[PDB]
Amino acid sequence: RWNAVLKLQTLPRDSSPSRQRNRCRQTGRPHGFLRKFGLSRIKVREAAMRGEIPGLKKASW
């Protein structure tokens, strides 16, 4: 929820600055993200196929 995404709040609660987690930027999924892009595993793929992600290419075999 817009409330759960409290990560956006620079100043954390009673917890130390370590409280700040991550949260995806496109979908906002805290589950599996990718620091480098800051996007979730389900967004990095959709963004990859579209080609909106520069330098990124689908590995072949």
Binding site: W2, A4, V5, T27
Partner: protein, 87 residues
């Protein structure tokens, strides 16, 4: 002509909390406004209250209910069923 492929629409808000209550089991009945969302596993056993436009009705999600939208279990109109309303 339904369609979901691999892009289900689950309002990012009613999906983040439903997962938060998964920390240790489930949580008491919750309330959501956007019924456009679709029912899924994580929401099994929980009691989500959909907004019919006037109030929130408790909808006990079930595995058999998975796949359908919350709005489908939240009737908009209200027909007294002018009768002995049996069965």
């Amino acid at each position: 002509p339904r369609s979901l492929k691999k892009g289900p629409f689950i309002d990012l808000h009613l999906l983040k909390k439903v997962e938060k209550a998964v920390e240790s089991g489930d949580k008491k009945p919750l309330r959501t406004w956007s019924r456009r969302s679709t029912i899924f596993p994580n929401m099994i056993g929980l009691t989500i209250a959909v907004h019919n436009g006037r109030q929130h009705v408790p909808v006990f999600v079930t595995d058999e209910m998975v796949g359908h939208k919350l709005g489908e279990f939240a009737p908009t109109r209200t027909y007294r069923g002018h009768a002995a309303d049996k069965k």
